[PDB]
Design a protein around this ligand. Structure first.
Ligand SMILES: [Zn+2]
Ligand SMILES: [Zn+2]
Ligand SMILES: [Zn+2]
Ligand SMILES: [Zn+2]
Lengths: 208, 208, 201, 201
């Protein structure tokens, strides 16, 4: 089929063109499989400085062997000092989590997002229906940071004095800016005050 | 810390610069977390046309919920027609699989590569030690295609008449070309003749 | 050694001297399901793990549910908790135990969910209250899997149960969440929590 | 219903009327480990799954091994196969069964590994030969996990066993792979396969 022939052609000419014209990783990036812009473009860094895992809806699920293997290898073997969870606006995973459809094996993966919805129902309830998905994309990032900070791998690193920070941002495609959701942890105590403040701030609604 | 401030700065100016100057996915790409060049650069395609999963040593393990969820969502929900496994030269995963070190949780993930080594030991044995890792990177791609073609998700798609092809390439950083290892499957019967021919071809060695 | 050498002797002298239920229990529990229920061998198809969990994304537990439901054609799935559960007590403590703590974070989330109720309770009875609440929550999880909802969708007969076995008196006690469809899952789950919230002196 | 309503009655009238081993068995098997070994309740810490597997990357089975080895401090791990195994027969057939076939591909790889041996054998005895070979291979897998090799490394006492329970005569039969260290794992694994390769008339 033509699409495969086109990759071979696109590849051959790209390599030829790069030649005509003319590394330790420092971050573990946990992003979404349906994110559109690659992390190296968005952050403008050189090849090799990101070690990358991508899964549906940028989740850190307590018992995933694939993501947890990557986090252990990055922290214990490669000695990386910053883990970043990046969500994004118009996320297909989040919309699929709020819809009522049965999609098969993938719905099982998305049930973790539905539990987060009910945790903040009284707030989201006194919000007009059409604004809820944007608030939930924000709250999901805050809860995944809270999850990463509770793993045995991260808590044990903090306990033995290893320097490690956790960050939770949203990539806003409408202006290309990364927006800080306010949960930033360098320890167990900072994880709690920071998580609690962020939710209280997120809970004062526009009177409209 | 400065590295985080530098991402914020790099992001703000990239977004400003893109503005100063100025989508259905078609492939599922299964590549390696330590690959250096992103798939969208290497293949020269526009944002959104690849749905992407990245794990250590580009594996399709029979029972991984993360990778299998992605493959089911791509095939059954998004209707993608081509799955590509891309290995690469100087792969850190493959070298870590051949070394004798205990690295922790990650070694468990790499035990699947060691089983492939023993399957082709008589060939690899009559090869000089220093050339074995390159032959194994090639043979791993051939065996992962063989694995993807045996999953319940792929065999059931073929059985119900859905068009789907599987490909196994190696990205050679030394010339930027993608090299076909010779296993290409559009059905169960083509998977077997093709896999068997490829191994027999890979087994005639340089007399030197 | 000795402990093993003995094992063979026991067996050697012991040798001289279609299942209808899928049972999901705890690796701790000491009385086998077969014993406390008094069933014939081969009647039960069995999975056991730490704190009797149905985690949304576990390939081991999910495979067993699909094989049971789709290939063997079983009509009842039972989740059984128990008092003095090691998994539960481990989840309420603050110790770090390694890889297993990750498996146990699912229980700690359930604790926060019912904090006001548990917080106007006496300290010495809170763990028993959590063991009861856990069972209610795992049945709620089993009823939300794609494998179980698809069987209901297509009209297959399947029922879900959540009980607590008390070692003290040996009696199974029904916790009140019982589902034969998605709507019965909601109503019984909600009624169950409200009853738990009426507290006695 | 009826089947359940009965279950409670049995239990209700039944109620009237530190573990030292980790046991990994098959979800099929019908005689509990506790019965065929004749041990006291609480002595065994139990995990059961389809075809008694130790897959390199299973979080459920690995969690249990770590909790058992690192927190409870158990010194023996036993893998038990059995004759007339449903998982094994399912792996040798060509049918598609759904999600479970993915779990079973690990057995089919083992079959190809010993094809010449099995190919100059009579068709009617090949499955029994594969059941024996599977047990040998899963012990070999358990002995290569990071959790088990790290315990050996640091000097902790731990032994691995691989047996086959024959329903016909009720006797456990040792398949010959027995490991107390990594070197004893290699030698006994190799000797075991060579014996299997001497065939009788
Ligand atoms: Zn997304
Ligand atoms: Zn690699
Ligand atoms: Zn328990
Ligand atoms: Zn069996």
């Amino acid at each position: 089929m033509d699409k495969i022939k086109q990759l071979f052609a696109n590849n051959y000419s790209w390599a030829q063109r790069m030649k005509e014209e003319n590394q330790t990783p420092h971050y573990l990036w946990i992003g979404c499989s349906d994110s559109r812009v690659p992390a190296e473009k968005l952050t403008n860094l050189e090849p090799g400085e990101l070690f990358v895992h991508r899964n549906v809806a940028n989740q850190v699920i307590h018992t995933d062997f694939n993501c947890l293997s990557v986090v252990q290898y990055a922290v214990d073997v490669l000695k990386i000092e910053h883990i970043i969870i990046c969500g994004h606006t118009n996320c297909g995973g989040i919309h699929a989590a709020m819809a009522d459809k049965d999609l098969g094996l993938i719905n099982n993966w998305l049930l973790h997002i539905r539990d987060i919805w009910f945790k903040h129902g009284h707030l989201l309830g006194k919000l007009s229906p059409e604004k809820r998905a944007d608030m939930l994309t924000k709250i999901n990032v805050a809860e995944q940071v809270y999850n990463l900070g509770r793993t045995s791998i991260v808590k044990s690193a903090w306990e033995r004095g290893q320097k490690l920070s956790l960050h939770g941002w949203v990539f806003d495609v409408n202006d290309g800016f990364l927006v800080d959701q306010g949960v930033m942890a360098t320890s167990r105590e900072t994880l709690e005050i920071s998580y609690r403040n962020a939710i209280a701030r997120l809970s004062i609604l526009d009177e409209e």
